[PDB]
Design a protein around this ligand. Structure first.
Ligand code: HEC
Ligand code: NH3
Length: 114
């Protein structure tokens, strides 16, 4: 949860994201504490959209495990809500980051965006 260390991780994320504009992925400023799938202007996959509609909020404790495996996290979230029938298919332009500390740190950095 070292935000400054997270800034360096965020350079990897900038392959697809920016803070303040949509790119391959949605803009991330304000993502922490926000309903999943609700960045203005961005067309989400069914899986990413349905997860937010089912009540997924991007708290730090949700973002960190998500970053290791977006598809598996979102499917598990929906399945535990009794909504496996909304979990069919996969996300867009999928990226995984294995390193846990890097995930924790970048998530602290995301909170600094707003
Ligand atoms: C392109 C290969 C990506 C890289 C590198 C990273 N992300 Fe990403 N992310 C990408 C897309 C195309 C999407 C939307 C997928 C969909 O199916 O609609 C996302 C989504 C996120 C989210 C969820 C945002 C929301 O619900 O509003 C988060 C929190 C996120 N991405 C974070 C993130 C970080 C921190 C990354 C670096 C470790 C990162 N992503 C890389 C595409 C890509
Ligand atoms: N992502």
């Amino acid at each position: 949860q070292d935000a400054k260390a997270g800034e360096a991780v965020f350079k990897q994320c900038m392959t697809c994201h920016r803070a303040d504009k949509n790119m391959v992925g949605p803009a991330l400023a304000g993502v922490v504490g926000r309903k999943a799938g609700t960045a203005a202007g961005f067309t989400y996959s069914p899986l990413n959209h349905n997860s937010g509609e089912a009540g997924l909020v991007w708290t730090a404790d949700n973002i960190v495990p998500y970053l290791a495996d977006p598809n598996a996290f979102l499917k598990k979230f929906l399945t535990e809500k009794g909504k496996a029938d909304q979990a069919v298919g996969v996300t867009k332009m999928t990226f995984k980051l294995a390193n846990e500390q890097q995930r924790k740190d970048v998530v602290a950095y995301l909170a600094t965006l707003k």
